């Protein structure tokens, strides 16, 4: 029975979706079939986004979020945003999938999608301030600068398209970790707001990838030593590894992670010549020292340095990844919806065999009742 | 690029455990070699059955739960549950799984589990009385004893032992949905918290199956009009459905409907000669009408008659499988830390090729600055 197997479904081919396609051996990224260069370059903010990657077309942005104060109050935003979705279904009176029709379903997955944005919001500005009046909130016009304006009310207009450029670049990849969970307990036919909450448990991890290096560190050596080639020669030099760098996941640099960068010079980051001196003295130590593998930048050092700009603290960064990462989530969760078919794989049992209850270790300091 | 597969991982082989064993050929279910219908018999109670999955042996029992009152009231025990465990991370500082040893890990289980079973036994209670006394329910010796006294203030010993006795049926049945979903998030090497919190979505789904019956408005039917046979021909022959029957899931005869049937007798439960002739006569008329297929009885008929015994409303059964199944699911959750692999399958790109985002239909409605 053993079968001689490799575990984890490495590799295993479980759907067949048309939302969107990672093409990494031609260095390119399409949300049905539209290129992430082409939308950035035409400034389509997230709100428009969103629509796309669910519905298949334009027409049916993203609605404003309605007034509705924040209950958890935790210290961690993920614990915050977690715990604060699940309970929207009861007061709001959402059914299961199985007792609902396509159109309902998308209407309340947008309602409850735009509602996690205002939470984050919430509860990165603190209890200790009081709220940002709502009149001042409605004077905006698109999603992304609502957002900003809840949470630092008089918020820089260059720091709202770096956020609106992250979001978009962040919207969809294709079948990873925490959208494999929303599609699974989507298959059991419980309501939206469950899924999305399941998957943000599957966000949290660190083995998930894709969030925010930790190089805000060694761009604070580099900053007072004015060398950036000696720096890295000497975290290399003691047994340490590169944030940031490694090996490549496209043919070649990736998409998102040139976007990123184009997006820091031309908006005029400050910390933007310190980043590129890193970036170019990591890629030449690292490339001389094995010159047979393929180095390439992650895309994670870029999204730190963006991220950084828009006054983003370093504990609040996964939260942000979360954020964009909704339009997929959403758009999987519908088209699971209409598959209709449950997900159960299944294992083989390699334990012991039969035996009786006191042949067990332990069995003399068990109590049995009378 | 497909080539003519069935989607859903359905009957894909992933993990190998040596939990526990479903021997659907030989009509047995065993837990780490011993019989599940031994462990009744002599009088086993779930505090050591936890133990038990999760440790390969006895010694170690479920410690008793510390004074913390429910934080959530939002009219759903499942949805009081669900959010009350991921808050315990920030407060007690819980770390990812990550960053800890086996035997961290397994402690910060055990502390969780028994909270999850005084959170639903405060919730179940209300908020219309006051609490019990913390005195009063340290009175008693076992786990399941102290849930009943938290929760009815005076149980009757006869509903502890059913309770005890359906919570150890209910412990493991394998590798479902739910277990499914607790293994792929604690792979990503989250916390504990983040895990538990996850499988109780999709436990909350329909389809998930495993949920007691709604046979009580039947079987009060049948107590005031007399025979059974009639009441079960007119739900047939008037185009609805009988509640608890279905296509077989072992061999003959589920081991966990036969216990289940054999403690209700024991007890004394008044609804006794009730149930068991509704259910000669639904066999027999399903299985005259339709005889080439094999037809059994539901192990969630005898469940919902069980709880039922135990004063458990109808709406408060689907939150007392999820007490039960908690043993599983920690036994599962360490397995995988173990292990060390993440889960992560693949899908197939079949949507629409290259295109400007001018030729998508909807274009003509998205607003663009300069």
């Given at each position: 029975?053993?079968?001689?197997?490799?575990?984890?479904?490495?590799?295993?081919?479980?759907?067949?979706?048309?939302?969107?396609?990672?093409?990494?051996?031609?260095?390119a990224l399409?949300?049905?079939?539209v290129d992430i260069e082409d939308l950035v370059s035409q400034?389509?903010?997230?709100?428009?986004?969103?629509?796309?990657?669910?519905?298949?077309?334009?027409?049916?942005?993203?609605?404003?979020?309605?007034?509705?104060?924040?209950?958890?109050?935790?210290?961690?935003?993920?614990?915050?945003?977690?715990?604060?979705?699940?309970?929207?279904?009861?007061?709001?009176?959402?059914?299961?999938?199985?007792?609902?029709?396509?159109?309902?379903?998308?209407?309340?997955?947008?309602?409850?999608?735009?509602?996690?944005?205002?939470?984050?919001?919430?509860?990165?500005?603190?209890?200790?301030?009081?709220?940002?009046?709502?009149?001042?909130?409605?004077?905006?016009?698109?999603?992304?600068?609502?957002?900003?304006?809840?949470?630092?009310?008089?918020?820089?207009?260059?720091?709202?398209?770096?956020?609106?450029?992250?979001?978009?670049?962040?919207?969809?990849?294709?079948?990873?970790?925490?959208?494999?969970?929303?599609?699974?307990?989507?298959?059991?036919?419980?309501?939206?707001?469950?899924?999305?909450?399941?998957?943000?448990?599957?966000?949290?991890?660190?083995?998930?990838?894709?969030?925010?290096?930790?190089?805000?560190?060694?761009?604070?050596?580099?900053?007072?030593?004015?060398?950036?080639?000696?720096?890295?020669?000497?975290?290399?030099?003691?047994?340490?590894?590169?944030?940031?760098?490694?090996?490549?996941?496209?043919?070649?640099?990736?998409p998102?992670?040139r976007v990123?960068?184009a997006?820091?010079?031309?908006?005029?980051?400050?910390?933007?010549?310190?980043?590129?001196?890193?970036?170019?003295?990591?890629?030449?130590?690292?490339?001389?020292?094995?010159?047979?593998?393929?180095?390439?930048?992650?895309?994670?050092?870029?999204?730190?340095?963006?991220?950084?700009?828009?006054?983003?603290?370093?504990?609040?960064?996964?939260?942000?990844?979360?954020?964009?990462?909704?339009?997929?989530?959403?758009?999987?969760?519908?088209?699971?919806?209409?598959?209709?078919?449950?997900?159960?794989?299944?294992?083989?049992?390699?334990?012991?065999?039969?035996?009786?209850?006191?042949?067990?270790?332990?069995?003399?300091?068990?109590?049995?009742?009378?």
């Amino acid at each position: 029975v053993p079968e001689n197997f490799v575990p984890g479904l490495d590799g295993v081919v479980a759907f067949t979706t048309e939302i969107a396609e990672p093409d990494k051996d031609g260095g390119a990224l399409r949300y049905r079939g539209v290129d992430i260069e082409d939308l950035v370059s035409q400034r389509v903010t997230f709100g428009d986004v969103w629509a796309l990657l669910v519905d298949g077309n334009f027409g049916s942005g993203l609605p404003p979020a309605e007034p509705f104060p924040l209950p958890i109050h935790s210290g961690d935003v993920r614990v915050d945003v977690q715990a604060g979705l699940a309970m929207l279904a009861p007061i709001w009176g959402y059914a299961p999938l199985l007792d609902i029709d396509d159109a309902t379903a998308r209407q309340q997955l947008a309602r409850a999608s735009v509602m996690a944005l205002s939470y984050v919001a919430q509860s990165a500005r603190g209890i200790y301030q009081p709220a940002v009046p709502q009149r001042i909130i409605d004077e905006k016009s698109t999603v992304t600068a609502r957002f900003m304006t809840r949470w630092q009310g008089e918020p820089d207009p260059r720091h709202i398209e770096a956020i609106d450029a992250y979001w978009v670049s962040a919207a969809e990849h294709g079948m990873n970790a925490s959208t494999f969970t929303a599609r699974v307990i989507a298959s059991t036919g419980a309501d939206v707001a469950a899924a999305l909450s399941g998957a943000i448990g599957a966000m949290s991890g660190p083995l998930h990838g894709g969030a925010p290096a930790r190089v805000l560190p060694m761009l604070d050596e580099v900053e007072r030593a004015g060398d950036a080639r000696s720096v890295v020669k000497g975290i290399l030099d003691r047994g340490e590894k590169l944030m940031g760098f490694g090996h490549r996941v496209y043919r070649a640099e990736d998409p998102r992670a040139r976007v990123l960068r184009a997006a820091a010079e031309r908006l005029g980051a400050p910390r933007y010549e310190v980043a590129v001196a890193v970036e170019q003295a990591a890629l030449s130590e690292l490339r001389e020292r094995r010159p047979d593998r393929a180095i390439e930048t992650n895309v994670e050092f870029w999204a730190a340095v963006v991220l950084d700009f828009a006054r983003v603290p370093a504990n609040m960064m996964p939260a942000m990844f979360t954020c964009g990462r909704t339009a997929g989530w959403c758009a999987h969760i519908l088209e699971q919806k209409r598959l209709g078919k449950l997900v159960r794989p299944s294992a083989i049992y390699v334990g012991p065999g039969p035996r009786s209850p006191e042949s067990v270790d332990g069995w003399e300091r068990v109590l049995t009742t009378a």
